[PDB]
RNA sequence: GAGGGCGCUUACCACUUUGUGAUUCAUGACUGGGGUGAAGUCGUAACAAGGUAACCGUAGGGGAACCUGCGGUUGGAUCA
RNA sequence: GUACGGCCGCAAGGUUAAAACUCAAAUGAAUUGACGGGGGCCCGCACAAGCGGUGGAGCAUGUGGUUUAAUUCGAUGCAA
RNA sequence: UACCCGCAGAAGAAGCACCGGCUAACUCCGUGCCAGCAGCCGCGGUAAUACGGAGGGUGCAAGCGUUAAUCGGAAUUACUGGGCGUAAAGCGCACGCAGGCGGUUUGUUAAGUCAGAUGUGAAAUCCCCGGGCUCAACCUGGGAACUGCAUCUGAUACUGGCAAGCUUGAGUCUCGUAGAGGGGGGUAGAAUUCCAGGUGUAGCGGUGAAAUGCGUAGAGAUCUGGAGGAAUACCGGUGGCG
RNA sequence: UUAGCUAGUAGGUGGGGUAACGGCUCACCUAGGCGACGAUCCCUAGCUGGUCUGAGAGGAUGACCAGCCACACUGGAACUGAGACACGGUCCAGACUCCUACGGGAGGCAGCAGUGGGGAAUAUUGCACAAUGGGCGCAAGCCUGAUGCAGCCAUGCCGCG
């Protein structure tokens, strides 16, 4: 338990990542958003209305 | 609909509650930033919206949006909240006033300055 | 002498005290469900006759949607 | 139609009946489609009836993968 | 002091919000679901009129925006002025007290109602016609209003009260008609299952197929007898009663 | 989702008390009184003229000015007085603050400025009694933070640059 809490303190002390020479690389693709909305009722309906307004 | 029915029991109108209950009908309220952080919006938006758990004077503890680009807010930063909902953030119903008591203005904003507490730049 | 005053005394009463209720605010181990999120696990209940027609009341059962019994409704397809 | 409270009930539960929180909808009817382990009619080497195949083998060829200094790039369901 | 006169010089004096739609006003650059915007819808993932900057423009102006709050728009509590078959909405049904409402004729009363008048409805405020601050704000004269209340006078169609009525509503009585309308007690026939026994023998039963199960301790099948419970084929009907 | 409440309670006779009627109080008698037309209990709240919005009806609202009410640190009480149960009067008790020689005493800005505080937020410790008004006075006149004015703030309206 003391080494666990001291590892928390180790993070608080010198956790910041030293960038250089990756030991291994992981090729994934995520971590922001994977959303297309797929519900082209709104997007095309506003476009519809805007085109009617312009023309 | 029948007039006797109304006489016995009148029209009970819609009672309506405020959607900014912490301000207690006050246009702005001072609060202390308990926590300053960023949170992910809900779908379909995506960002790291800047927000702060703030403890008002009236005792309430709410969560307040930090408008504008870049801020100096930290723990214990005394700020004002003004009400105003952030739709794409669940349970964030107050906007932090810029230029208000700790919250410095937006750095290098040249238009719509007043909503962010930025002075008129001098030539 | 009458009468007054002080004192004393009783009556009413505030502070305060006691006991016991009530009611409301906060809080509480643990717990019941609910909403939201990310969309992960098990199934696939409903939507077509959704592949066992669905639903309503009730009863019982079951990891879970549900399943089955009794009564009801059509807000059920097909009938060439 | 849930909690709490009240009334009722032997019980199951019934009745009265909120609030916080939350979404920008939810709904109803009809319309065009598509879809159906809905229905009807017709057709395709669709099945059936047949013939010979591929999958096994060696080789050619292309591809995936792997390897390399590079194994240039593209095609990558049917429709690479 | 108001106010008036004189001096010099354009001198001392313009910002805020917004420009996707709703909403008046569009382009480039930066950026790439990041940074960020947002009142709703929504923008942002490389040509962004929606983010940040510039140019332009638009609305406002010593203000301009944001926030808070009230009313509106919201006929979205519908008194004016909503709706309930399926969108939320008809109690499961009836009986019925209080309550609301009430067919038709005369007369009375005159409460409701109506006409007038009186007292009042403070002043300010709103509104109207004028006056004064150089105008306006502001001040201010008069009026109207204060939609109300009480008292008196009068009106009598309607509603109300009272008296009398009338039969069209409602109700009774007479004779019939149809009905699975309700309660009670009997009873009949078919069938199921069981029990007993007769014949009889190798399967029965079941499903899409099977197995569990019942059978040689004689099933299943067929016949007779017995017992018991429940529901009433046909009639039987988009027929009846409630 | 507060259904029962009420014993001086409701009434009466008599006595008392008030400036005055009265359960206002007392004795006794009666056994009443309130409540679905919402009694009672809980929450909120000063009321109004008005203000804002609205075509209107309504809805919200009750800052300023004016009428009424209630309160004067909190809880009581009376006294004087035509008038008070009395803001800058009195007595008592309490909390707080102050003085003390420790025995005991003092005070009340919700008057005007002002201070600390709370808050998103709201002004000067100004001039004057010259006008109006008030108290006293035969009168002069005295007093008057009412009031008339000035200061500060774009807080609103209006005007102008
Ligand atoms: Mg759309
Ligand atoms: Mg099912
Ligand atoms: Mg299914
Ligand atoms: Mg199935
Ligand atoms: Mg089914
Ligand atoms: Mg179904
Ligand atoms: Mg079962
Ligand atoms: Mg319940
Ligand atoms: Mg539909
Ligand atoms: Mg089809
Ligand atoms: Mg074939
Ligand atoms: Mg091979
Ligand atoms: Mg081969
Ligand atoms: Mg290749
Ligand atoms: Mg091919
Ligand atoms: Mg702009
Ligand atoms: Mg436009
Ligand atoms: Mg903007
Ligand atoms: Mg992109
Ligand atoms: Mg670009
Ligand atoms: Mg915009
Ligand atoms: Mg309305
Ligand atoms: Mg509104
Ligand atoms: Mg409607
Ligand atoms: Mg429905
Ligand atoms: Mg419905
Ligand atoms: Mg019904
Ligand atoms: Mg009549
Ligand atoms: Mg009359
Ligand atoms: Mg009249
Ligand atoms: Mg008046
Ligand atoms: Mg004039
Ligand atoms: Mg009459
Ligand atoms: Mg007759
Ligand atoms: Mg008496
Ligand atoms: Mg109060
Ligand atoms: Mg209106
Ligand atoms: Mg006192
Ligand atoms: Mg005080
Ligand atoms: Mg005197
Ligand atoms: Mg006296
Ligand atoms: Mg007094
Ligand atoms: Mg004082
Ligand atoms: Mg003061
Ligand atoms: Mg003093
Ligand atoms: Mg101060
Ligand atoms: Mg402060
Ligand atoms: Mg000052
Ligand atoms: Mg004077
Ligand atoms: Mg003096
Ligand atoms: Mg000014």
Q: What is the DSSP string of B17-50?
A: --S-GGGTT-S-EEEEEEEEEEE---TT----EE
CA distance readout (Å), B111 to B79, B108, B114: 23, 9, 8
> Among B97, B38, B103, which residue's Cα sits nearest to residue B77?
B103
- CB-based burial, A25-41: b 16+ in 10 Å, e otherwise: eeeeeeeeeeeeeeeee
Phi, psi of B11, rounded to the nearest 5 degrees: -70, 115
Domain range spanning residue B88? 1-123
Disruptive mutation site among B38, B46, B49 for chain A (greatest number of A CBs within 10 Å): B46
Structural domain total, chain B = 1
Beta bridge partners of B29: B81
The pair of structure tokens assigned to A9 is 């303190």
Q: Are B39 and B51 in contact (CB under 8 A)?
A: yes
DSSP count for chain A of H helices, then E strands: 2, 0
Is B46's CB within 8 Å of A35's CB? yes
The SS3 of residue A11 is: helix
**What resolution in angstrom units was achieved for this structure?**
2.8
H or E, element range at A53: helix A42-54
Establish whether B8 is an annotated binding residue.
Answer: no
Experimental method: cryo-EM
- Cα B23 from Cα B82, distance rounded (Å): 8
CA dihedral A14, A16, A21, A24 (to 10 degrees): 100
- Cα A50 from Cα B66, distance rounded (Å): 32
- Cα B57 from Cα B79, distance rounded (Å): 11
User: Exposure of B26 by Cβ count < 10 A (0-12 exposed, 13-18 middle, 19+ buried)?
Assistant: middle
Q: Are A2 and B16 in contact (CB under 8 A)?
A: no
Q: Are B56 and B81 in contact (CB under 8 A)?
A: yes
Kindly identify the ligand whose nearest atom is closest to the C-alpha of B115. 18
Q: Which residue is nearest to nucleotide E52 (CA to C1')?
A: B109
Beta bridge partners of B42: none
CA B47 to chain centre: 18
- Cα A44 from Cα A37, distance rounded (Å): 12
CA distance readout (Å), A50 to A12, A44, B105: 54, 10, 36
> Among B83, B79, B103, which residue's Cα sits nearest to residue B92?
B83
The CATH number of the domain where B23 resides is what? 2.40.50.140
The SS3 of residue B51 is: strand
Q: B10 — contact with chain A (CB < 8 Å)? A: no
């Amino acid at each position: 338990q003391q080494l666990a809490e001291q590892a928390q303190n180790h993070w608080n002390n010198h956790t910041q990542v030293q960038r250089g020479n990756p030991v291994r690389t992981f090729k994934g693709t995520d971590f922001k958003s994977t959303y297309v909305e797929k519900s082209y009722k709104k997007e095309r309906a506003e476009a519809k209305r805007e085109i009617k307004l312009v023309v | 609909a029948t007039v006797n029915q109304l006489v016995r029991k009148p029209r009970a109108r819609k009672v309506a509650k405020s959607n900014v209950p912490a301000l207690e009908a006050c246009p702005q309220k001072r609060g202390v930033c308990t926590r300053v952080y960023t949170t992910t919006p809900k779908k379909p938006n995506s960002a790291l919206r800047k927000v702060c758990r703030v403890r008002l004077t009236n005792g309430f503890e709410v969560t307040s949006y930090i408008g504008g680009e870049g801020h100096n807010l930290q723990e214990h930063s005394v700020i004002l909240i003004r009400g105003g909902r952030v739709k794409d953030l669940p349970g964030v119903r107050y906007h932090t006033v810029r230029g208000a008591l700790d919250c410095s203005g937006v750095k290098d904003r040249k238009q719509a300055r007043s909503k962010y507490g930025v002075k008129r730049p001098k030539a």
